[PDB]
């Protein structure tokens, strides 16, 4: 019981209104991974009803970009500014 599937953040479908990424799952619900916890350094989407968990390859640059799209409170800048 660990994350043996790992999807790149770009493939994960992002819901800017929910401030999270989801992945289409057949069972009754879709995999859900919260940007809040992704920022915490943890990356794994859990699906309800079937109760599956999968890892998600995230990036610093992706988080910041999505943060603006999802309309979240400005995050602390990453070590990449030129
Ligand atoms: Zn599911």
């Amino acid at each position: 019981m660990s994350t043996y599937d790992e999807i790149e953040i770009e493939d994960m479908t992002f819901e800017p209104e929910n401030q999270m990424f989801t992945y289409p799952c057949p069972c009754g619900d879709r995999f859900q991974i919260y940007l809040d916890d992704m920022f915490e350094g943890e990356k794994v989407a859990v699906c309800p009803s079937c109760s599956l968990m999968i890892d998600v390859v995230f990036d610093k640059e992706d988080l910041a970009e999505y943060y603006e799209e999802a309309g979240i409170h400005p995050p602390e800048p990453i070590a990449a500014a030129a």
Side-chain angles (χ1 to χ4, degrees):
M1 293 181 175
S2 302
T3 42
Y4 281 94
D5 219 296
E6 186 178 88
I7 309 90
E8 295 167 79
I9 187 169
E10 60 172 81
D11 188 45
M12 299 287 298
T13 306
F14 53 85
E15 280 68 30
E17 316 94 319
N18 294 147
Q19 288 77 85
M20 65 176 180
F21 287 71
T22 60
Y23 204 64
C25 176
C27 66
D29 214 317
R30 37 165 168 59
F31 290 94
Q32 295 174 148
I33 180 178
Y34 311 100
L35 213 293
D36 179 278
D37 199 49
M38 299 180 70
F39 181 78
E40 290 298 87
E42 198 64 71
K43 64 288 177 298
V44 41
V46 58
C47 192
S49 294
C50 71
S51 292
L52 240 180
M53 298 167 300
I54 51 83
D55 206 295
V56 176
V57 186
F58 72 102
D59 203 286
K60 313 162 303 304
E61 311 185 307
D62 287 83
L63 298 182
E65 204 62 72
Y66 176 73
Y67 236 90
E68 296 303 275
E69 291 191 85
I72 342 182
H73 279 228
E76 297 180 80
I78 58 178

